[PDB]
Design a protein around this ligand. Structure first.
Ligand SMILES: *C(=O)[C@@H]([C@@H]1NC(C(=O)O)=C(S[C@@H]2CN[C@H](C(=O)N(C)C)C2)[C@@H]1C)[C@@H](C)O
Ligand SMILES: *C(=O)[C@@H]([C@@H]1NC(C(=O)O)=C(S[C@@H]2CN[C@H](C(=O)N(C)C)C2)[C@@H]1C)[C@@H](C)O
Ligand SMILES: *C(=O)[C@@H]([C@@H]1NC(C(=O)O)=C(S[C@@H]2CN[C@H](C(=O)N(C)C)C2)[C@@H]1C)[C@@H](C)O
Ligand SMILES: [Mg+2]
Ligand SMILES: [Mg+2]
Ligand SMILES: [Mg+2]
Ligand SMILES: [Zn+2]
Ligand SMILES: [Zn+2]
Ligand SMILES: [Zn+2]
Ligand SMILES: [Zn+2]
Lengths: 385, 385, 385
């Protein structure tokens, strides 16, 4: 059959028949830059054999059930750096490169960490020091760490279904492909809270990470990701990264594509504290900082979204609750990247576990499928004890 | 020789040496989407050949003379589904894919027919129901039928060589490649007449068919054309369709490319009332409605352009006069698609004739070349009697 | 080896690791059109190898030292049409196509010359005769010759580093890829000096050569260059030329890529007075007018930039002083094209010498390295006497 690839403008409203083919062919739809691999590839050898089962409603389900019910296109579970489980669906295979959506927020964050290690960014510096086009804007004075914590205080209307929202204006900037358009949008925004006091999920603010990384390194973010990680630990396959315009700027908040085992290798890099062959790519304590759960902080689990989301926020990572509030099997400081339509990159340092889930849910957010994904993941964590 | 391909901005002004090469290489100039063929092809067996000859001035002319005088790059005459004539010129061959200009208006309209047959669009419904971008403009309340009949009554200046004309504006929006630029222009236009009362040929109004089709099916129009026609009856070759923007929206009013016999197959589809292998693709009575001649209607042949044009208008088809006013050998309810610089798709149901003409006239409109084409086609209809 | 290619917006600010790869891969960064070669290639036979040496400070330097000191990617010296010196650096070889920056202004000027020979342009005619969208602008009444001499009198701010300059707006128009955007900028500019009295280096005015060439020939400028010179002389390889937009208009002031020996062939065309195989392409006396040094002219050597620059101007060519103020070895009427970061095309008719220099200086203009380039070229001239 011919590939069913949607219009560029319809990415967030494709019919189910068009999602898998578009999600794995984003380079046919948007401008992109190649994230090059190297010549050495980090091995992912076979590991513990598991057949995880979980209970929901009153019924028991295995892996094929999970994948059928949630329209899952890929599942990878790494234990101790070794493949415990690897499945493909929806026509995907080991060579498929699938798009990240907001999962790439956590990759950008980790690269900011690499830039901190090199001295090229500092958490404490104001964003306008690196990005002079923000001079005079509400972002002037906001720090890099405040951007990482979605706590700039700049007013941001994220609702996609409001034609007037900032997220829709940013998506139209992308579709227009005029370089610097998102930055100009961000520079127009008024301030609403004191900086550092208020969580507002902003896809534009997350994009600012990509802008900062380019400004600090003076090379394309895709090449920095390659030199710091993709070619250094050794991913198996090139990736690629959606840009704002041709040969332009990577979208910091969305649009990275990679093989399933390469998403897993990135997770394994984070699980291993950023160390590749004895050299520290990430600052000492970076992963602890980026996934920190502090009871008094306004980012703590339970405290976001009027109190009815369970997960907190770190440096562009969602943080699982700890202690009495923990979700079953996800205690000990688990954290994750997520993207709409059911993309997950789950890291459990206590258990040395990395999980990657690729999905094509009909709708961008579905609470029952998120909760099912966590039940399935917790059953895998339980079976790997 | 390497191909002589014009700048994208110059499509309506190319010098004669750049016209044939550009018209068969439009995918090297503009963004395009592929119209996929199937694996079965509807045959076009050879019939009894014809060598029609006709008189102009005091001179008699064959097909070769006609081809030379009108700078014809292709002519195809089908008689009851069989090839009575097939000639190529200007360096074209059987595999050449030549652009349609406004001939695609009639393809889009027929796809609207297919959507009516599937219950996805209705002639009496307003266009802004399907196209929210039109709500609050002078198109609000205009019905799908009135769009097909170029009778919205919205003020539209079609003249090309005036820089500030609406047609030039819409071409500028295509050349900018911003998704939705054409719809934004259309939404900015004032009402001039009550709708359903006055014919105004508008290339933007005709594009609305493309936008309506995607809004009702939620798949690219190229893919709807493929599933409904191009892969169902089986064209011999892929087509392609010019877009407003990279991976964007098909131009409903211009810019489809296909081989000469695939244009013939589409004419045959219409001639055969939109049935393929016993399946109805078009509503019963669609072709009749779409080529309607009613003396009372403002659309009747002889009323358009305040009497100075012999042809009337249907559902984006031009209608030939019937009765006493018939042009020689074109009685019985013949109708046609046409495009500037000499493109024709002529359908004579009485005679069971489909004819395709590809030309590269130096100017977009030459009355004398139009008249000579009707004289040649009439000679061909006569020869096939 | 994956090339280190910058963001399109960063061309004038790349870090050194990114300059050589980007300069030879501009077709991966901007829209381009191919400049096609022909079927025959004009040979550049081997001559007597020279090993020029010159003294800077108190030190002897040869070709290798020149090259390592000024980060030179290529050097070609032709004497009487024969290769006296040919060296590649920075990873380049005989098939590299390296970008020209402003060197192409002199190519555009020479094509205007070709159009004057064919009668399609005239030096004393106003540019708004050929570009009607400049009627009513500061260019109204400005002649073709005045544009050639950078002497339109239109007010123009070249400052790259000022974000509001006209050069920045031009480059923004380019990045936004909207057809005709540069001409729109040009038509917005106010009058400053009476036309043909003062020299103001204007990248936009130089781009105007390209717009004029297309208006007067009605074919893409790349194809005109091909038919007049590239395919006729016999270049060795295709070139290509940066555009304003995909399949759009060539940038008249920047962005041509060619192999080293093909730049040499173009210089040799100029040196042979614009005749190829007995077919005169440039008007008699064109090279004379285009490189004129006339002490009473506002363009004479020593008059530009309040007398702070040794070189005068001609038809988009820089002219070396003659007489008592001649640079050593550079007397007799030498002239050159130059481009930022160290690109030179030097033509010395008296000595029958053509020199091409390709460099990747860290900064656009470094006076020190320019002076050293002229001392090295002078040493070549001496060695070639
Ligand atoms: C990333 O995939 C997109 C953004 N990510 C989310 C998200 O967090 O799911 C939203 S915002 C919206 C707020 N309430 C929901 C939520 O937080 N959860 C279900 C956890 C989702 C964006 C669409 C980005 C590509 O725009
Ligand atoms: C399609 O080819 C272009 C439009 N088609 C015509 C046309 O051929 O009719 C016009 S302009 C004007 C309106 N009616 C005149 C006419 O009756 N004939 C040529 C027969 C010409 C447009 C330019 C479309 C791509 O704009
Ligand atoms: C060409 O490479 C760029 C333009 N070229 C020049 C140039 O000729 O160096 C400049 S402007 C600058 C102003 N005065 C300079 C000079 O020659 N001296 C100070 C001695 C020339 C442009 C940037 C083009 C790509 O824009
Ligand atoms: Mg196993
Ligand atoms: Mg019905
Ligand atoms: Mg020769
Ligand atoms: Zn850069
Ligand atoms: Zn309505
Ligand atoms: Zn769609
Ligand atoms: Zn043209």
């Amino acid at each position: 059959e011919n590939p069913r690839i949607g219009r560029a403008a319809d990415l967030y409203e494709l019919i189910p028949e068009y999602q898998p083919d578009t999600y794995r062919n984003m380079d046919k739809v948007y401008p992109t830059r190649v994230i090059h691999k190297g010549t050495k590839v980090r091995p992912l050898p076979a590991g513990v054999a598991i057949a995880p089962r979980y209970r929901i409603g009153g019924e028991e389900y295995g892996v094929d059930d999970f994948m059928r019910r949630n329209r899952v296109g890929g599942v990878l579970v790494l234990k101790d750096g070794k493949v415990a489980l690897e499945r493909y669906g929806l026509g995907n295979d080991e060579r498929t490169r699938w798009t990240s959506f907001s999962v790439v927020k956590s990759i950008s964050s980790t690269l900011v960490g690499a830039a901190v290690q090199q001295g090229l960014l500092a958490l404490d510096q104001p964003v306008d020091k690196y990005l002079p086009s923000l001079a005079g804007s509400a972002y002037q004075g906001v720090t890099v760490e405040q951007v990482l914590q979605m706590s700039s205080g700049v007013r941001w209307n994220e609702t996609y279904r409001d034609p007037k929202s900032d997220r829709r204006q940013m998506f139209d900037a992308q579709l227009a492909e005029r370089p610097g358009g998102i930055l100009r949008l961000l520079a127009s925004l008024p301030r609403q809270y004191p900086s550092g006091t208020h969580f507002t999920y902003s896809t534009g603010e997350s994009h600012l990470q990509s802008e900062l990384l380019h400004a600090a390194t003076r090379i394309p973010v895709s090449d920095y990701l390659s030199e710091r990680i993709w070619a250094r630990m050794g991913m198996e396959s090139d990736g690629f990264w959606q840009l704002e315009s041709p040969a332009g700027q990577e979208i910091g908040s969305s649009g990275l594509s990679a093989t399933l085992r390469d998403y897993g290798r990135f997770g394994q890099f984070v699980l291993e504290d950023g160390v590749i062959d004895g050299e520290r790519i990430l600052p000492e304590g970076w992963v602890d900082r980026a996934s920190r759960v502090e009871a008094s902080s306004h980012l703590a689990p339970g405290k976001l979204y009027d109190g009815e989301y369970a997960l907190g926020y770190g440096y562009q990572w969602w943080t699982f609750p700890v202690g009495a509030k923990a979700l079953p099997e996800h205690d000990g400081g688990a954290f994750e990247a997520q993207g709409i339509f059911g993309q997950y990159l789950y890291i459990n340092r206590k258990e040395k576990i990395v999980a990657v889930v690729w999905s094509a849910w009909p709708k961008p957010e579905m609470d029952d499928r998120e909760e099912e994904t966590y039940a399935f993941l917790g059953a895998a964590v339980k079976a790997l004890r």
